[PDB]
Amino acid sequence: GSQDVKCSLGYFPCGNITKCLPQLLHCNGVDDCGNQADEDNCG
Ligand SMILES: [Ca+2]
């Protein structure tokens, strides 16, 4: 029954926003999530 939960394999959610992007854009130094959550202290 749950819907829009987590992202499929090979993708990750920006956080509390409904959206998923490939690891390629993860900490890639590019604005995409909008809230800059993926670029938040990437380490
Ligand atoms: Ca990014």
Curated annotation (Swiss-Prot):
Residue positions binding Ca(2+): 25, 28, 30, 32, 38-39
Known glycosylation sites: 16
Compartments reported by the entry: Cell membrane
Cysteine disulfide partners in this protein: 7-20, 14-33, 27-42
Subunit structure: Interacts with C1QTNF8.
Similarity remark: Belongs to the G-protein coupled receptor 1 family.
UniProt-recorded name of the protein: Relaxin receptor 1
Species this chain originates from: Homo sapiens (Human)
Gene name for this UniProt entry: RXFP1
Whole-protein coverage range: 23 to 63 of 757
